[PDB]
């Protein structure tokens, strides 16, 4: 009643007095890192958290990234809700990421070098899964449009770390930030030698991943667990995106091991210039243009050792004895 309004007014005065603790962090910076199984994404996020674990069974994962905001001399915990690769377990994203935190969330996407073109395909599949998950939420479309507009403005806001709309810039205009992490970068020599992934083919794959990022309206970051490729830099970028930390990293696109370009560091033409390095592979070369996957291990199928039925062989031998 009126006493409830008064107690809430006292709580509001407490919130006003909380300016001595306000804006320390937006509590609820929950980042979901979806994707496909087998990439060891739990290992990557655990390395990001500074802890160590591999005992992530099937289902959701609920790692707590402890943000170290030494700028404000405070701390916060980030809900790292990571989902498994079972599309049969797709009915789980409703438990962690919801519409209330939908504005307060950041998506991710993992990558594996073995079937990287298929990893691009699986990334597209999981992103479509996320799209459907956002779709079934079904909030006010005006609020979703406003969030998409704010995200688009942020995409335009990417000043260089010293206008016109793109053709398909955020073709997946979900409206929340997306950051695809190109994991399994330690197998570069494995791709080059064992998988015979050519240097031109590797550059074409990188350009295709960048094209997918732009289609989603997102950025890419090449990294590996052992090589430690911009891992703390990735943490800095994540804090800058969600928690609003002071980003300072400049774009680095010369190398390929840790190619972590945020938005605004490459438009369609700049990527095409990077894609102009693809000579043997066509500029419109598909994912299968350099994908290889031999059917190894020869899994069972031992010719199905069985003999004739008693009645069937009985009839056959009866006909034979009719002849004989």
Q: Is 228 left (phi over 0), alpha (psi -120 to 50) or beta?
A: left
Task: Consult the annotation and say whether 249 binds a ligand.
Answer: no
**39 assigned to a ligand binding site:** yes
Q: Is 153 in the site for another protein (CB under 8 A)?
A: no
Shortest approach of another protein to residue 176 CB, angstroms?
20
Q: What is the CA radius of gyration of the chain?
A: 26
Residues in the chain, how many?
A: 324
Nearer to another protein, 152 or 187 (CB): 187
**CB-CB neighbours of 122 under 10 Å:** 22
Decide if residue 298 touches another protein (CB under 8 A): yes
3-state secondary structure 98-119: CCCCCCCEEEEECCCCCCHHHH
Q: Any known ligand binding at 41?
A: yes
Classified as helix, coil or strand, 67 is: strand
Which listed residue (50, 59, 161, 283) binds another protein by CB under 8 A? 59
Q: Are 143 and 151 in contact (CB under 8 A)?
A: no
CB atoms within 10 A of CB 129: 17
Region near another protein per CB under 8 A, out of 51-59, 126-134, 207-215, 255-263: 51-59
264 in a labelled binding site: no
69 phi and psi angles, rounded to 5 deg: -85, 75
Among 6, 23, 71, 95, binds another protein (CB under 8 A): 95
The reply to whether 199 sits in an annotated binding site is: no
What are the residues binding another protein (CB under 8 A)? 10-11, 13-14, 17-18, 20-21, 55-64, 77, 79, 86, 88-89, 91-92, 95, 297-298, 300
Which residues belong to the annotated binding site for ATP?
Answer: 35-42
Known binding positions: 35-42
């Amino acid at each position: 009643s009126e006493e409830e309004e008064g107690q809430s007014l006292w709580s509001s005065i407490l919130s006003e007095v909380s300016t001595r603790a306000r804006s320390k962090l937006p509590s609820g910076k929950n980042i979901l890192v979806f994707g496909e199984d087998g990439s060891g994404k739990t290992t990557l996020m655990t390395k990001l958290q500074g802890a160590e674990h591999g005992k992530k069974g099937r289902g959701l994962e609920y790692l707590y990234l402890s943000v170290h905001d030494e700028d404000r001399d405070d701390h916060t915990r980030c809900n790292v809700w990571i989902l498994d690769g079972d599309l049969y377990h797709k009915g789980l994203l409703k438990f962690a990421v919801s519409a209330e935190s939908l504005p307060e969330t950041l998506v991710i996407f993992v990558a594996d070098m073995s079937r990287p073109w298929t990893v691009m395909e699986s990334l597209q599949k999981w992103a479509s899964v996320l799209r459907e998950h956002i779709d079934k939420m079904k909030i006010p479309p005006e609020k979703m449009r406003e969030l998409e507009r704010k995200f688009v403005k942020d995409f335009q806001d990417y000043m260089e770390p010293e206008l016109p709309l793109g053709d398909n810039v955020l073709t997946h205009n979900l409206g929340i930030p997306v950051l695809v992490v190109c994991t399994k970068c330690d197998a570069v020599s494995v791709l080059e030698k064992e998988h015979d992934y050519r240097d031109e083919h590797l550059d074409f794959i990188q350009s295709h991943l960048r094209r997918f990022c732009l289609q989603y309206g997102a950025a890419l970051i090449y990294t590996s667990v052992k090589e430690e490729k911009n891992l703390d830099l990735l943490y800095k970028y994540i804090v800058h995106k969600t928690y609003g930390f002071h980003f300072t990293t400049p774009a680095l696109v010369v190398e390929k091991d840790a190619v972590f370009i945020p938005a605004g560091w490459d438009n369609e033409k700049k990527i095409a210039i990077l894609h102009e390095n693809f000579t043997t592979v066509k500029p419109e070369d598909a994912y299968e243009d350099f994908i290889v996957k031999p059917p190894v291990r020869k899994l069972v199928h031992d010719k199905e050792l069985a003999a004739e039925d008693e009645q069937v062989f009985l009839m056959k031998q009866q006909s034979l004895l009719a002849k004989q």
